[PDB]
Amino acid sequence: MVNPTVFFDIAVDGEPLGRVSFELFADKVPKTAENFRALSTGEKGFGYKGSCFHRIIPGFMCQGGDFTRHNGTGGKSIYGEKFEDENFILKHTGPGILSMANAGPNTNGSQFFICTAKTEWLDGKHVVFGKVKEGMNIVEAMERFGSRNGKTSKKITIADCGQLE
Ligand SMILES: C#CCN(Cc1ccc(N)cc1)C(=O)NCC(=O)OCC
Known part of the structure; x- marks a missing residue:
């Protein structure tokens, strides 16, 4: 019944x-x-x-989350190439919100985003499913490698990931 915790x-x-x-x-x-x-x-x-x-x-x-094409055009879910929008109970209330990227209704795969601002205009269009617990400072450090058009100035990778006890 306790919500799971994962790390990157x-x-x-x-x-x-x-x-x-x-x-x-x-x-x-x-x-x-x-x-x-x-x-x-x-x-x-x-x-x-x-x-x-x-x-x-x-x-x-x-x-991130595009582990098949590395550029926003790929990824897949554990249920198939894509899955439905589960619900929109949760909103994009500020920095640290974890939400699914998509290409239209009912097109969730593996791609996700971490908000670094409130993104209210995405409410009801992208499924919010988590939030940063620890290391928002690390998100903020990653954010400094981005740009206006989204291209990163250094390669930002998930070197390791998994589930915390
Ligand atoms: C190009 C590209 C990637 N993409 C389209 C996309 C997203 C998810 C999946 N599974 C497939 C394509 C998107 O990034 N679409 C917009 C979005 O989700 O923005 C969140 C702030």
Whole structure:
């Protein structure tokens, strides 16, 4: 019944930066939380380890999770290539919100974003499923490698990831 916690160890051109951990709201969005959790442990045989943050826009969000094409055009969920929008109970209330990227209704895969500002205009369009627990400072450090158009100035990778006890 306690919401799960997952971590990401972040590197910058291969050099360790720090760890960000996330509370996944499995009490409110279990299907979506489970997908992110499993992708984070790699227990299905695929997932986030080694993948990059391909789009980082300071004052907006950091986006990653495209472990098949590395640029925002790929990824897949543990349920198939895509899955439905589970619900929109949770809103984009400020920095640290963890939400699913998508390409239209009912097109969730593996891509996600971490907000670094309130993004209210995404409410009811993107499924919010977690929040940063520890290491928002590390998110803020990653954010400084982004740009207005989202292209990063150094390669930002998930060097390791998994589930915390
Ligand atoms: C290019 C590209 C990637 N992409 C389209 C996309 C997203 C998720 C999945 N599974 C497939 C395509 C998107 O990034 N779409 C907009 C979005 O979700 O922004 C969140 C702030």
